[PDB]
Amino acid sequence: PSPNLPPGFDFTDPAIYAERLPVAEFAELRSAAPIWWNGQDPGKGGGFHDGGFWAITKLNDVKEISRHSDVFSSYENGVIPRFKNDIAREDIEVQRFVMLNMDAPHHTRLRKIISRGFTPRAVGRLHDELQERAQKIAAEAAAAGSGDFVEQVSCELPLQAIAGLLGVPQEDRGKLFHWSNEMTGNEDPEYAHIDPKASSAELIGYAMKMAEEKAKNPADDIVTQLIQADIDGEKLSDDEFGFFVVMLAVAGNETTRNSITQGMMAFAEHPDQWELYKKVRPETAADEIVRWATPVTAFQRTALRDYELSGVQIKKGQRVVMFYRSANFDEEVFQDPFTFNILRNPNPHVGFGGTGAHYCIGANLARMTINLIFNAVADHMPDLKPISAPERLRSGWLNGIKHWQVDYTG
Numbered sequence: 001p002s003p004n005l006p007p008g009f010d011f012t013d014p015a016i017y018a019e020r021l022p023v024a025e026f027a028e029l030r031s032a033a034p035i036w037w038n039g040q041d042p043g044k045g046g047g048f049h050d051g052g053f054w055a056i057t058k059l060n061d062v063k064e065i066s067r068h069s070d071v072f073s074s075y076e077n078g079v080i081p082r083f084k085n086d087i088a089r090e091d092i093e094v095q096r097f098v099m100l101n102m103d104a105p106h107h108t109r110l111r112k113i114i115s116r117g118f119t120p121r122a123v124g125r126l127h128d129e130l131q132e133r134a135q136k137i138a139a140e141a142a143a144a145g146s147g148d149f150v151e152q153v154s155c156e157l158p159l160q161a162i163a164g165l166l167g168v169p170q171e172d173r174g175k176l177f178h179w180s181n182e183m184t185g186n187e188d189p190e191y192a193h194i195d196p197k198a199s200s201a202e203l204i205g206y207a208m209k210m211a212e213e214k215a216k217n218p219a220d221d222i223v224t225q226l227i228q229a230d231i232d233g234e235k236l237s238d239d240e241f242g243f244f245v246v247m248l249a250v251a252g253n254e255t256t257r258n259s260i261t262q263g264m265m266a267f268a269e270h271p272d273q274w275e276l277y278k279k280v281r282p283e284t285a286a287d288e289i290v291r292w293a294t295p296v297t298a299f300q301r302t303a304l305r306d307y308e309l310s311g312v313q314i315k316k317g318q319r320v321v322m323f324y325r326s327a328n329f330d331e332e333v334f335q336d337p338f339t340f341n342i343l344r345n346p347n348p349h350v351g352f353g354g355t356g357a358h359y360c361i362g363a364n365l366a367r368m369t370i371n372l373i374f375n376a377v378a379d380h381m382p383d384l385k386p387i388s389a390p391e392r393l394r395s396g397w398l399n400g401i402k403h404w405q406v407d408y409t410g
């Protein structure tokens with residue numbers, strides 16, 4: 001029997017996410033049609049005019065698609081499944097210059113060079129400066145009594161993580177944070193005037209300046225390890241470094257910020273978990289927060305050939321959209337998936353995507369960022385309470401919270 005969904009229901013519809021997460025509709029597919037053709041009417045495909053896509057709602061299918069990168073292509077259509085309906089195909093294809101939208105061997109070369117800047121050591125060297133800044137951010141917010149938890153608690157730390165990682169001088173971080181914020185959310189009315197293409201161009205030019213300058217004066221940031229040829233002469237070109245900063249500026253901003261916001265929303269709704277967190281401060285909460293928040297609701301792939309996924313015949317050229325929001329609540333993998341449990345161990349969520357070639361390289365930078373900020377929130381505003389309901393981001397693939405007015409005192 002066909003799933004009980006409204007006719008023409010598009011799981012990438014930004015109008016849905018502007019108001020809520022379609023949790024019931026996802027649970028419907030998981031039970032009635034775990035792989036389901038999401039038909040899209042002409043001119044309503046978010047920039048893709050192929051008739052629709054396969055909705056992937058089971059965690060095991062999500063992991064299988066991520067492992068079989070040989071078949072399921074990130075390059076053919078990019079991984080973002082929704083833009084403005086009228087986006088030019090060329091603006092979709094320009095994203096193929098960043099590592100995330102690439103296939104092997106091009107992606108294999110970039111990922112190896114980029115791995116020099118995401119070592120455990122490099123990330124861990126930021127721990128003390130980020131812990132200090134997390135405490136300062138929580139105290140500054142708690143002194144204000146009440147305000148916007150999104151802007152006053154969640155925004156700054158993930159952005160300072162990028163600046164610290166990249167070695168951006170303090171006087172340039174406002175420049176960088178603006179460019180990063182100018183690239184996501186252009187389908188929301190609050191951000192209708194941002195220009196991601198223009199912001200990407202200025203960020204590339206600024207990143208090439210940094211690349212040229214840091215060859216002359218090598219430092220101990222990741223940049224030096226990136227633009228430096230190894231014994232094989234392998235390194236990022238100046239423009240390749242530009243496209244990485246563009247990817248990093250976007251990747252390391254809203255996803256962590258929404259983890260933090262939706263993490264505190266879960267704590268506000270599960271006071272038993274909040275009291276437990278303030279007492280034990282378990283770092284496993286970071287993963288449960290990411291599982292709950294699922295900041296990236298979905299990324300997509302295009303099949304390079306016919307493939308049988310869980311009895312469903314995927315035909316060459318069709319898109320598959322991996323709904324991490326649904327897979328992260330798969331009843332087959334998680335015990336009581338709708339219970340917020342900051343002790344969940346092990347926690348094989350696909351919030352950072354399915355294991356494979358494209359697994360999130362900043363996952364532990366994100367986990368550290370989340371853990372430091374919530375320790376600060378517990379340190380300085382342990383009795384905070386929301387004063388109103390959060391405003392959601394109108395986006396077809398990003399689970400965003402624009403604003404959340406909170407009283408940090410009580």
Ligand code: HEM
Pocket residue numbers: 066074079099100101111162247248251252253255256259290294295296299350351352353354357358359360361362363365366
């Ligand atoms: C809560 C925070 C985050 C979430 C939910 C998240 C989510 C994801 C997901 C789902 C993927 C899967 C890509 C795919 O399989 O198509 C990914 C990849 C990636 N992430 Fe993250 N991410 C987070 C934080 C970060 C941070 C802080 C950085 C960098 C500072 C980062 C950098 C990247 C990059 C570069 C990739 C591409 C990897 C590749 O193409 O090989 N992410 N991320």
Ligand SMILES: O=S(=O)(Nc1ccc(Cc2ccncc2)cc1)c1ccccc1
Pocket residue numbers: 080095096098100101183184196200246247250251252255296360
């Ligand atoms: O750089 S991108 O070509 N592609 C891109 C980049 C980041 C993201 C978001 C993300 C967050 C965390 N981990 C992984 C991903 C998605 C897609 C791009 C740049 C600007 C506007 C749209 C896309």
Ligand SMILES: [Cl-]
Pocket residue numbers: 015
């Ligand atoms: Cl609408």
Ligand SMILES: [Cl-]
Pocket residue numbers: 094095097098200246
């Ligand atoms: Cl770009």
